[PDB]
Each structure stands twice: as C-alpha cells, then as structure tokens.
Design a protein around this ligand. Structure first.
Ligand SMILES: *[C@@H]1O[C@H](CO)[C@@H](O[C@@H]2O[C@H](CO)[C@@H](O)[C@H](O)[C@H]2NC(C)=O)[C@H](O)[C@H]1NC(C)=O
Ligand SMILES: *[C@@H]1O[C@H](CO)[C@@H](O)[C@H](O)[C@H]1NC(C)=O
Lengths: 49, 36
C-alpha cells in the first residue's frame, strides 16, 4: 500500500524519472505500474508476482 | 496614492500565429514512450 494504493506485486528500484509534481506512473491499461515512495524520494517499478 | 495617467495611446493590437505552443501536462501522472 502506498498512500492508500492497495495492490499485490514485486517492487523494484526504477530508472523512470518522475518529475517533481508526479506521484504515480501508469501503463496503457490505465493501472499504476510505478510509484514514488512517500518516505524516501525514489521511483519503484510495480510488477505482478 | 493612486494617480492615473492621461498619456494613454489607442491602437488596435496585432494578431500573431501561435504555432504549436501551449500544451501542458494534463494530469499529475507519469506516462512514457506512448501516445495518449
Ligand atoms: C481617473 O480617470 C478615470 C478615467 O480614465 C476616472 O474614471 C471616471 O470616473 C468618472 C466619475 O468620477 C466616471 O463618470 C467616468 O465614467 C470614469 N471613466 C472611466 C473611463 O472609467 C477616475 O475617476 C479618475 N480618478 C482619479 C482619482 O483621477
Ligand atoms: C521521519 O521523521 C524524522 C523526524 O521527523 C526524520 O528524522 C526522518 O528523516 C524522517 N524520515 C525520512 C525517511 O526522511
């Protein structure tokens, strides 16, 4: 869960450069597939297990 | 202290062709190598 965004997956460190105003990233299917961590400001990939 | 100026010059303003500017990020979300 990040900021209320519940889901099951494998987290990984990412090279997707979210700009300062962004918090989540999404795929062509309109689902969140990356999210910056609200405590330490890095971007995490989300992949289904 | 708020004194207006008589020196106003009236002339109809020019038009200019704004080519492809004024796009902005439409929502607070990341997307990449995609058409949306
Ligand atoms: C400054 O000038 C403007 C006009 O450019 C004045 O506005 C006018 O005010 C009178 C009443 O005093 C109105 O009858 C007019 O219709 C107003 N004209 C416009 C174009 O707004 C304004 O009162 C002036 N103020 C000072 C402090 O000189
Ligand atoms: C959490 O808060 C404490 C004190 O307010 C601070 O020292 C700490 O760095 C914070 N955590 C992070 C990840 O910054």
């Amino acid at each position: 869960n990040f900021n209320g965004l519940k889901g099951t997956g494998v987290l990984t460190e990412s090279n997707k450069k979210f700009l300062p105003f962004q918090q989540f990233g999404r795929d062509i299917a309109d689902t969140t597939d990356a999210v910056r961590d609200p405590q330490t400001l890095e971007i995490l990939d989300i992949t289904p297990c | 202290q708020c004194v207006n100026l008589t020196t106003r010059t009236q002339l109809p303003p020019a038009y200019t062709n704004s080519f492809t500017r004024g796009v902005y990020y439409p929502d607070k979300v990341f997307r990449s190598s995609v058409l949306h």
